[PDB]
Amino acid sequence: DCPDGWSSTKSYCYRPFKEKKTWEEAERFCTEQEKEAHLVSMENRLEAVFVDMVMENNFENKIYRSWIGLKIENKGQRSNLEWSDGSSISYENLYEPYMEKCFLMDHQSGLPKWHTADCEEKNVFMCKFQLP
Amino acid sequence: FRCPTTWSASKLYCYKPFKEKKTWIEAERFCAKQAENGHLVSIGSAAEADFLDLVIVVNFRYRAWTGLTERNLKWTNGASVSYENLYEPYIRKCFVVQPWEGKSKWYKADCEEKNAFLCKFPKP
């Protein structure tokens, strides 16, 4: 069974949070739940629709901007970069500047598209985890 | 341990630029045919970057594929991003090296663009 305060489907538990955080704070907060969780992910359209309906049911059917569990950055060994020979990213000399982009869903009207944003924005978010 | 003729040897690796223009994947596949553990070049330090720049100057304005590419998106829970509702498409790019003020810099490029390329393989 999902804990109190979480919405359940067959296999997953979801929970919206109103306390605004940075993307890293939000993800960290999710991972620290009594059952380790993550920022919401969506693996098909119906799940995206469900997640949006849960958010709306919690935010008075209003517009919102919620972190989701994607981030890309181009610096260091957790970057979205890789060498074809499998060596680590230990040195970089990119023309482009070091940057990070965190993803969110922005509900304006209808199912939110997923936009990139400054990771230090303070947004609402949702946690998800899988039942055993 | 002698690097094959036309390849340039560092302590641990053999390097060679090739002028014939290829997509990123067919360059990578060409490098892997050249030798055990052959790949497009990886650059692991400033000293290797400088050495590679010499390799290029000995051989050749250049634009050449490296082994650096972007990864697929992956959810923080470890799942692959299969389904998306992205506002704008995420399209994995690959990186070429080009001269920038006497050293070189790494630039994003379309993976299907044909470029010269740089191969590396470990000695032994």
Q: Catalogue the E-assigned strands of chain A.
A: 7-8, 12-21, 38-39, 64-73, 81-83, 100-107, 113-117, 123-130
SS3 A33: coil
Tell me the domain boundaries of chain A.
1-132
CB contact under 8 A, B86 and A85: no
* CATH code linked to domain A1-132: 3.10.100.10
Residue A43's identity, in one-letter code, is E
The dihedral through the CA atoms of A32, A36, A40, A41 has a sign that is positive
Sign of the four-CA dihedral B44, B45, B47, B53: positive
Which candidate, B31, B25, B15, places its Cα nearest to that of B94? B25
* Residues in chain B within 8 Å Cβ distance of A45: 83, 85
Note whether A76 and A116 are within 8 A (CB). Answer: no
| Listed resolution, Å | 1.9
Q: What angle do CA B82, B67, A98 make, to 5 degrees?
A: 75
Residue B106 to residue A94, Cβ atoms within 8 A? yes
Domains, chain B, with CATH or none = 1-124 (3.10.100.10)
A-chain residues near B48 (CB < 8 A) = 91
